[PDB]
Write a structure and sequence with these properties.
The PDB classes it as viral protein. With 151 residues, the chain is an alpha/beta fold. It contains 6 helices and 6 strands, in the order αβββαβαβαααβ. It has helices at 4-15, 54-64, 77-85, 100-103, 107-114, 124-136, and strands at residues 24-28, 36-41, 46-51, 70-73, 92-95, 145-146. Helix 1 crosses helix 2 (54-64) and helix 5 packs across helix 6 (124-136). The chain is globular and about 40 Å long.
Amino acid sequence: NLTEIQEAVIREAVGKLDPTNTLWLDIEGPATDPVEMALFQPAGKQYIHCFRAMPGVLSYVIGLLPPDMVVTTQGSDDIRKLFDLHGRRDLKLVDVRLTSEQARQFDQQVWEKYGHLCKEPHCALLDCIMFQSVLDGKLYEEELTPLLPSS
């Protein structure tokens, strides 16, 4: 349901992910029909990002994640269900459960620095950067390389 070109691009992007490093996954919208999905590796200063077909891309990405890898999210009740339905029971999930208040610690700085990648406002990619910043106790402000160019 994806063109072989799309599949080859996605495959190469996922292949550049390093399994030994933290990997964030965030989905905006219904699990079966996302509007946005983002994957973010702070240590490798890289991300995969795309908006509104989406279900095909998300499924293909899940199928390609490295074996037994730890995925970090801000809530994975449905992501767990998706993983499993796609034959990825081996993927491990961690939910970083910042309170609304905690998650806003670096909201404005992150929007200032990275808001152009998405342009009280929220997008999947920046949420991950914001949460990682809270964990680091300081603003994430590295230069980020997209791994997956807008098709």
